[PDB]
A paper describes a structure:
The [name] capsid, similar to other herpesviruses, has a triangulation (T) number of 16 and is composed of major capsid proteins (MCPs), small capsid proteins (SCPs), and triplexes.
The A-capsid is empty, whereas the C-capsid is fully packed with genomic DNA, and the B-capsid contains a core of scaffold proteins but without genomic DNA. It has been speculated that A- and B-capsids assemble with abortive genomic DNA packing. From the same dataset, we selected a total of 14,252 and 8899 particles for [name] C-capsid and A-capsid, respectively, and, by imposing icosahedral symmetry, obtained three-dimensional (3D) reconstructions at resolutions of 4.43 and 4.53 Å, respectively. Local reconstructions were then carried out to finally obtain the cryo-EM structures of the C-capsid 5-, 3-, and 2-fold sub-regions at 3.31, 3.46, and 3.43 Å, respectively, and the A-capsid 5-, 3-, and 2-fold sub-regions at 3.64, 3.50, and 3.41 Å, respectively. The structures of the [name] A-capsid and C-capsid are nearly identical except for the presence of CATCs in the latter. Because the Tf triplex is located at the icosahedral 3-fold axis, the densities were smeared during 3D reconstruction with imposed icosahedral symmetry. The models of the asymmetric units derived from icosahedral reconstructions of the A- and C-capsids are nearly identical, with a root mean square deviation of 0.298 Å over 26,091 atoms, with the Cα positions of the two models aligned. However, the same strategy was unable to procure a 3D reconstruction of the portal vertex of the [name] A-capsid, possibly indicating the instability or altered structural dynamics of the portal vertex in the A-capsid.
Author numbering:
A (entry chain h): 24 to 82, 94 to 340, 348 to 368
B (entry chain g): 51 to 326, 337 to 444
C (entry chain w): 199 to 247
D (entry chain p), E (entry chain m): 3 to 50
F (entry chain o): 1 to 296
G (entry chain s): 1 to 148, 168 to 296
H (entry chain w): 494 to 542
I (entry chain g): 1036 to 1054, 1056 to 1323
Write the structure that this text describes.
Amino acid sequence: RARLIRQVTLADFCEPQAERPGLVVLALRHPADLAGAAYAATPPGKNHRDLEEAWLALDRASVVSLNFLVAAAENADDALRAHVTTNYRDRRTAARLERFATVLRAMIRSHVFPHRALHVLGGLLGHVTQDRLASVTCVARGDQEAARTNDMAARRSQVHVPACALMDVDRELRLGGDDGLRFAYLVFVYTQRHRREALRVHVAVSRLPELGDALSFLLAGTRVDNAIHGTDEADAPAAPAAAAAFPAYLFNDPRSARCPTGRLNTPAAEALPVWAPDMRGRATRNSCMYAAYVRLGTVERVVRRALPLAHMERFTWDVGAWEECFF
Amino acid sequence: CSTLSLVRFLELGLSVACVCTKFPELSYVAEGTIQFEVQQPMIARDGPHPADQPVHNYMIKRLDRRSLNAAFSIAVEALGLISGENLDGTHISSAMRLRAIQQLARNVQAVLDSFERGTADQMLRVLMEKAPPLSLLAPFTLYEGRLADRVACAALVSELKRRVRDDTFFLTKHERNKDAVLDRLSDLVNCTAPSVAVARMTHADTQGRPVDGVLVTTAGVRQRLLHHVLTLADTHADVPVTYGEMVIANTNLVTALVMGKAVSNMDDVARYLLGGGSARVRADLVVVGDRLVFLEALEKRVYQATQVPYPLVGNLDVTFVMPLGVFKPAADRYARHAGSFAPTPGLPDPRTHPPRAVHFFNKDGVPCHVTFEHAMGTLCHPSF
Amino acid sequence: DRVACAALVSELKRRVRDDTFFLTKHERNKDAVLDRLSDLVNCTAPSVA
Amino acid sequence: RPAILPSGQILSNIEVHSHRALFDIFKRFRSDDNNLYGAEFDALLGTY
Amino acid sequence: RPAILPSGQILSNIEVHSHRALFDIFKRFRSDDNNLYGAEFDALLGTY
Amino acid sequence: MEVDIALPTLSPGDLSALQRCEGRVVFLETLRRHATLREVALPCGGDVLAAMAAYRRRFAAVITRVTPHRMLATPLGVGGRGQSLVLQNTGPFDLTNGDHVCLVPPLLGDECLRLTSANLELRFPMTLPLAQARELTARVVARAAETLRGGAPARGADVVFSNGRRYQLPPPHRDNAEAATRSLVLNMIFLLNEGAVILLSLIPNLLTLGAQDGYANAVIQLGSATRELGQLVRQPPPPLPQDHARRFCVFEALEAWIASASRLGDTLGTRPVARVCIFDGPPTVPPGEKAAVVEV
Amino acid sequence: MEVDIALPTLSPGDLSALQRCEGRVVFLETLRRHATLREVALPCGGDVLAAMAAYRRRFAAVITRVTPHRMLATPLGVGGRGQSLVLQNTGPFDLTNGDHVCLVPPLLGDECLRLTSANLELRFPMTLPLAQARELTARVVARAAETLQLPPPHRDNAEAATRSLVLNMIFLLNEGAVILLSLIPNLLTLGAQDGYANAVIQLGSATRELGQLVRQPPPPLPQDHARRFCVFEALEAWIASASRLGDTLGTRPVARVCIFDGPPTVPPGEKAAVVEV
Amino acid sequence: VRPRWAAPAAADQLLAPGNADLRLELHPAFDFFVAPEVDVPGPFAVPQV
Amino acid sequence: EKASESYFMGQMQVARTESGGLHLQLTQPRANVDLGVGFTAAYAAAALRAPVTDMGNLPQNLFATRGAPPMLDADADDYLRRTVNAGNRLAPVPVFGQMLPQVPAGLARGQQSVCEFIATPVSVDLAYFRRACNPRGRAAGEVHGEEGLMFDHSHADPAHPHRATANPWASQRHSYADRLYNGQYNMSGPAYSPCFKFFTPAEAVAKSRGLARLIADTGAAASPTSNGEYQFKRPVGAGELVEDPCALFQEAYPPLCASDSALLRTPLGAEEHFAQYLIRDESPLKG
Amino acid sequence: GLMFDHSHADPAHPHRATANPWASQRHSYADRLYNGQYNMSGPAYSPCF
């Protein structure tokens, strides 16, 4: 059998009566520490309190359904926007979606990436709701349909993913392979251009155990235009001094100026060459971050069928750790 | 094929060194004790100094935990056939099932037997660790009652320092004498004091008085003993065949369940407070001093054709010391005879110079020396 | 292990060159001959019955 | 440690956590803790 | 807290102070300690 | 596969303290159904690097119920179907629902049981969520490093948040933080510097490219296909005859660096050992209180 | 799930040799329930670097039974972490209890159960403990970096290894990393008053050769040295990288050894229980 | 560096299992040494062949 | 003796598990307790078999230890390491992960022991090495002498009341030899130090309340060393039974040694010729 | 690997590595005369073969 998680929370982002069971839910970090870590994390030149403001503009609420998050990104098919807007019961919902979009766009600008703010839980199956207070229940290991929903029309369930975001890889990369058991990865796509940036979401399946080079080639344009426009707003100095050239000719020189340890404060040792490695404004790793992914589980089949959707087949929940994709 | 030489524990001579009782509730008992009480005798002095009362004392000794185990792995293909699941209807699958079940029986046979040799080994492991050497023990029982002032303790250690280096190997450095061996064995059998009396032992010779102890050795020592110095007494002995028993019931039960303790002889204490099979086994005896002891060598009956080392081959540890470059004083360099190791005529005599190396013998006798330049590992280090 | 085979061969080397002839080197120790023969007889092991 | 045979029953129920003062030792486990089912005694075997 | 019925008698006497390192805890007394007489118990007088 | 531990009886009072640690983890040696308490013990004042390296050659196991006779443990590595089990959180800050825990030695000020009756000590490793631990290690190391160069000894920003409350990161001198962590900071800073030096020695002109148009272009070309700007690694000068006292073969140094870096990266944990799946309870477990967990 | 590998008809000269391969691992490409033997097969030995790069792109499988028709297998890790199985060792170093094992392509070749009837050959990878597999990968990748019991590289894929390595190294250089780079002499002087401090530094350290040859000036204060602090960020980045540097060149440890009763150390060529990770 | 031939090696420390002289001392009538792969006698400046 | 041990056998129980197969793992808890006041067993160690360890020589190499502040000039100690590790076994070769002595090939006899060296002034008397002696000179130990004897020097030596010590470089607290072979000075290594049990008072916590405790302790003390091809240090938990009367006396025995090969010849004869000396053997091994 | 290497000391007198540099190394002088696979065999019997 499979084991579950129950987390009482607010009916803010995941609204378990509006959707039927079988869709992945995410856990949202407490925003206080995000706002704090920004103060030290936003790069030089940029704003260092804009995430504070972006959060304050959206006023515990802990979960967020992927069905909701995918809408508040660049990539989305407007049918799903219309569904989320007109099918969610809740007041003021479209405004909240707009504010959440602004929040995530601030998150990437402040170099505190949302993948460090959204751990992933399993697919919800049950809920009891008071007035604007819910208690969702999702699987965490094992296969989905080992559960037992209190619908009584369909005791078991499946896993539903918005087909607008599901990006297949193998048939995409043309591996010539034959569909057997394939993994499932939820991937994020960052893009960094100051005041003009966005986030793209996808759900990727393939046989590839190690994404790496696969995404590095898949998202080539993103990495390209992100490495060059990413260092912007950082004052780089003038042309680098010739002293910056780290001297290599001097390693296996038999005759050269030398200095034993224990006489290094200010002795008659000034004859050593000077070398000033000077790195101020170049592309750091967080500057070239473009994607992040995390393993979800294993899958047999994907069929498309209805608002467009994508029913999984024998999903086995096995959540992994996050991963960076910068090189 | 090959059989399996079964062995039981009660038939061994070693059983007379321990009282075995089944206690099926041991897995429940926290730390258990036993209480002694001894009362030293006293003698009446006289004269000025005042007399002394007779002394009493109590004491307890607590238990300790040990256990045994033995793996029993059975296979895949065979567990399919045993349970009848993988069984097919043929005249060939049945035979393979018969084979697998014979394997399982021939396996559990060996596994269950191991719990006898287990105790046979455990007893030696226990006795061997609580017994002090004879050398360090004979003079200690010679200075009893006197180890109060420092001078007696000093003489005692000055005699230990000799005993340990003079009598730590007999019947290898004395293969010409016969009575020295016998005297050492009598000393060994008499240095020990009898323990408490229990009527469940009844370990007796075929004719008369009961036995007193064991003598476990190696086969080599037993062979060198049973042909020159010791004479067999008999070849059979009557031993008990039933274990002991200790169960909690009907008075210890209530106490262990509500209070938290349960004495063993509880029923006797109760009825006092309110008004209220010898087998014949083939062992080898011997008489030494004035006692009758078992004389065993368990290297063949048990421990044979397995992968454990016989626990009676001990390990002596000596630390040698030798001086390297000491130069004797002036008045002590002198030739015992004017015709010395005279060197070659015409060359200077290298026997007068300060030495710088020592020579000694290896394990077999090949010479191997040590010189200063072996000390570079020590005298050449920042630690200096 | 290595440490056991070491002592084993170091003892074989010593046994071969001390006891490779009896009845011609020890005719006095009449006991020693009987001991050697008993060692010889018991050193082997019985075969199938 | 807990009892085996109750002697007499109590007549009136009352909230107990309110009247903590009247007692000396107090212990209120939620339901069915582990310490109840441990019958681990200790006892001397022989006296000599 | 001494014993009432010894299970078995010791066979041999031996100077016991010098061998004190064999026991775990022990105590001698000169003669006729006063503690070992007055024994007081502890009784719970009802369960409810 | 549940192991029990013989317990040499200590005393009253102390056994209560041993009963209080009914939720922590202990590192066995081998999977045998018996073990002595003397075996699972570490001098509670010890080197953090060596302890973190030893945590790999052992098996984790959590202390279930204890009795004056023995205490029962359950290993985490091997297991059937990953059954549930209870765990006492003992880090400095709480851990939420639905994340991964990691086992690190008591990096900050230490707590250790001192069983004075049995004369042995115990160390119970901290239980940290993954990212917070990977960042706390860097925090303590960076503070020690800033101290090392004798610069500004304080910046008022050695603080870590977790679910609102601000944590203080106790001062780095309490038990032996100036001695039981020196090994770690040394072994990390040194390797970092060595990697940087090797890279710069293989590509001498890296830090003389365009401040914004050359370095980025080189990195993007390197990440992309095989252009590589020729042998971007210029041919290093030829070495000495390997008896000259100043021989330096750069490639063997790179080899040693790869090996040491891999080894150091593996002896840091950061591979989850469990995952909190609490259910029917307060969704956020504070320090010191047990929390339902399923092994990974 | 139990992968089923079907067999063609075989001569008794090699069926009995295949029977002896009961605890070795093979590399499928897709996890269908059925698969023919011809599919799961690798060419004869060549380019240990390329092969080691190929093990990453496929998930392993260990075999258990070999019948005259059918040969089972078990997909190593796709959803399980406690499926205790047995696999035999074939690496030179004997692996002891406690440590993990990683799969490494074979050296020198010569390990090929060349089947003539089926006209194919298999190369089962050897199994080494982690501590030594890391070192082997280090040696091979360094040797590949040299070309701008030992087979030579191929200059077509060695560049890919060099690229991965140089990327993982380049992204260590941070404006905080220079601050650490500034105290090399302050580190050497510390590696003198004590013993352990000197012990942690290697002999051909490739840094002591620098701290005694070049002086560097005080570092330039970075932009906004009041709001944020850089050393912490650089160190966190380096931890994140080094935690995953070993696998990116070799292979993650696939299983750790656990034995309940047998002797701790198991010699080469002998089966030993295991649990996967 | 110092040439091995000029500076005498040692008396005992020649036969230690570490030095690089046993590797070239294996005949009582000949000598072996490393030398530049040129012809003798050659030009004045020793090439780096 | 007729009844030396009470011995209680519990009830067997089977623990089942999965491992290709099904591992049934029996067990049986059992306990014992001595029940005789005074000693109830004794052994004699009659014969003698071959020495399990070699009795040759092996200079201990300190370069495997850490805790000694290295010298300033790196060239100096690099030259040191290059000139001491040359041709010296148990040199810490930098084999991966351990930097430990490499596995030798071929074994002459049992595991070769290790030797130490202790500085000592040349004017030390030689008659101090004929009988059993203590490498320190202060023969303190424990069996003869109360606390405060090991390091005090205002109280004459017990074994030679004439002089205070016999080696000032190895007896004072914090002396030279002490800083190398003591317990609480963190200068231990992987190799076994045969003199570790002569310069260590750390048993002050373990004060003795009876000679019988010391008698029983010897003949049953766990083995400190290992069983590999050398004498490596072994974790104390594992252990093995071994007897040693040296730990009771803190004394050593002089073997048959002499200062020139010419004196160890079958017509032994004279024991002091010239500057050269000979020392008869006085050990438990006269044969 | 013990017969010909000279990094591991003599397993009989471990002080040194070999007691005769002219009869131990591979292709040494004394080796080219009485080795089995080197083909200098005559009619006479060779004790040290």
